[PDB]
Design a protein around this ligand. Structure first.
Ligand code: HEM
Ligand SMILES: O=C(CCCCn1ccnc1)N[C@@H](Cc1ccccc1)C(=O)O
Length: 454
């Protein structure tokens, strides 16, 4: 079968289709029009966007396909280096860092991070308790304050103190501006035009800021000798069982940069979309709030109580279904192979997995695919293989999944325990795209139930 291809622009092929404010949503509309697979070409590049569980279940076979760096991840590698997300599977530092960090990211490790997550969650709740009557909440903004502070504290015992400020931390200014340059660079029809020389000088300056600040975090910790129970201590002290080697300081810096990207708007986006869907679905909100009140019987949640917030967990999975905040990942064929009995691929051929569109496969989810129904996730065994991929696939899946879900379940549970929510503007969903997704301008009012944290 010859696969379809969206409209072309002469020698720029399909590249101008990406020169839009909302490229993921544009690719979703192309998939609506063209179906489960389409070819996408740009100067020097061919890939194939997959959208059906039928084809993606094959693409997730690690004997046939391995992780590819998309152009986006190749550009992120200019500042995240051979950290875990921007490493190829065959680089020594991927498997080394993977083996060392897996124990730091397990459910067991979450028991140790729990108290630091609570510290930040209580700050969020106190901020909202302290708002004046008729004041509102800027939801993505506050969710990013919470997720950034949580990965700073659990990551390297650093307080970004995001609830004390409006202006971002200098590291975050350079990180966000670096990610903006990545997005801009993907959209340039003529990337070598001297009109972008200033952008490139700024990008290099931002790389240096991130390196300098993280290198000093690492140097300061080695100099103090402090043994806090954070990711940095584990990286300084751990040895890979396979090679017997530790990570060196440059790779530790790249991992820290990698975690800060991941724990910033990628994770806060999940909380923002979850709260959006809850306020647009009042019966779902009521059920989740009933669970929070039943389970969260103490002034601060315990680790075991967060594990008991089963419906809150289903709410988060259903938000990941509709708007997964890391919306694509890339693969390449390890050898010649045929996809779906119809599409022959050659060794090295690239695939993109378009996750929001996979999650809209009606052959899997049924006709009500746009509805927000957390009960879809009552039983993971009832979900077909590779139908639900917000955290990627296989050995290259998200190492932070348990971390992101624990922090999100904890704070959403506390939010639902402590406040009633009003969609006071009847907010119209507007999804802003960076390399992640967020409901731009999403605001609510939160009326306290006046339940103390003491
Ligand atoms: C809801 C929040 C998150 C989502 C949806 C998410 C999604 C993903 C996805 C889709 C991938 C695979 C990317 C690819 O194949 O190119 C990935 C990888 C990864 N994520 Fe996350 N992520 C989240 C939060 C986090 C957090 C909080 C951390 C750590 C602080 C983290 C650390 C990583 C790492 C290190 C990898 C690379 C794993 C490897 O290849 O060995 N992620 N994430
Ligand atoms: O595949 C990725 C990268 C997703 C990586 C997730 N991530 C990692 C760190 N922060 C976020 N983008 C997509 C969509 C896209 C297209 C053009 C411009 C921007 C985005 C693509 O190129 O098709």
């Amino acid at each position: 079968k010859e696969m379809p291809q969206p409209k072309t622009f002469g020698e720029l092929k399909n590249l101008p289709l990406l020169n839009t404010d909302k490229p993921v949503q544009a690719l979703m509309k192309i998939a609506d029009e063209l179906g489960e697979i389409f070819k996408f070409e740009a100067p020097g590049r061919v890939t194939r966007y997959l959208s059906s569980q039928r084809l993606i279940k094959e693409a997730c076979d690690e004997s046939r396909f391995d992780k590819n760096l998309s152009q986006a991840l190749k550009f992120v590698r200019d500042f995240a280096g051979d950290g875990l997300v921007t490493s190829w599977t065959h680089e020594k530092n991927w498997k080394k860092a993977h083996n060392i960090l897996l124990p730091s990211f397990s459910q067991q490790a979450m028991k140790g991070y729990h108290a630091m997550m609570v510290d930040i969650a209580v700050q969020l709740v106190q901020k909202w308790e302290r708002l004046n009557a008729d004041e509102h909440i800027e939801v993505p903004e506050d969710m990013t304050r919470l997720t950034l502070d949580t990965i700073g504290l659990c990551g390297f015992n650093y307080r970004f103190n995001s609830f004390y400020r409006d202006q971002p931390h200098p590291f975050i200014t350079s990180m966000v501006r670096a990610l903006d340059e990545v997005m801009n660079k993907l959209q340039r029809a003529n990337p070598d035009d001297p009109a972008y020389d200033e952008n490139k000088r700024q990008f290099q300056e931002d790389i240096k800021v991130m390196n300098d600040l993280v290198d000093k975090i690492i140097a300061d910790r080695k100099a103090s000798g402090e043994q806090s129970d954070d990711l940095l201590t584990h990286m300084l002290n751990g040895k890979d069982p396979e090679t017997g080697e530790p990570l060196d300081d440059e790779n530790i810096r790249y991992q820290i940069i990698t975690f800060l990207i991941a724990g910033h708007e990628v994770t806060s986006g999940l909380l923002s979309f979850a709260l959006y869907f809850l306020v647009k679905n009042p019966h779902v909100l009521q059920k989740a709030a009933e669970e929070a009140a039943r389970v969260l019987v103490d002034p601060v949640p315990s680790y075991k109580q967060v594990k008991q917030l089963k419906y809150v967990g289903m709410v988060l999975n259903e938000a990941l279904r509709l708007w997964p905040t890391a919306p694509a990942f890339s693969l390449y064929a390890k050898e010649d192979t045929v996809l779906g009995g119809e599409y022959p691929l050659e060794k090295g051929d690239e695939l993109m997995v378009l996750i929001p569109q996979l999650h809209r496969d009606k052959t899997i989810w049924g006709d009500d695919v746009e509805e927000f129904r957390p009960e879809r996730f009552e039983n993971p065994s009832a979900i077909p293989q590779h139908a639900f991929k917000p955290f990627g696939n296989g050995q290259r899946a998200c190492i932070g999944q348990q971390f992101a879900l624990h922090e999100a379940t904890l704070v959403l549970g506390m939010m639902l325990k402590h406040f009633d929510f009003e969609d006071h503007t009847n907010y119209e969903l507007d999804i802003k795209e960076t390399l992640t997704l967020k409901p731009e301008g999403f605001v609510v009012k939160a009326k306290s139930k006046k339940i103390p944290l003491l």
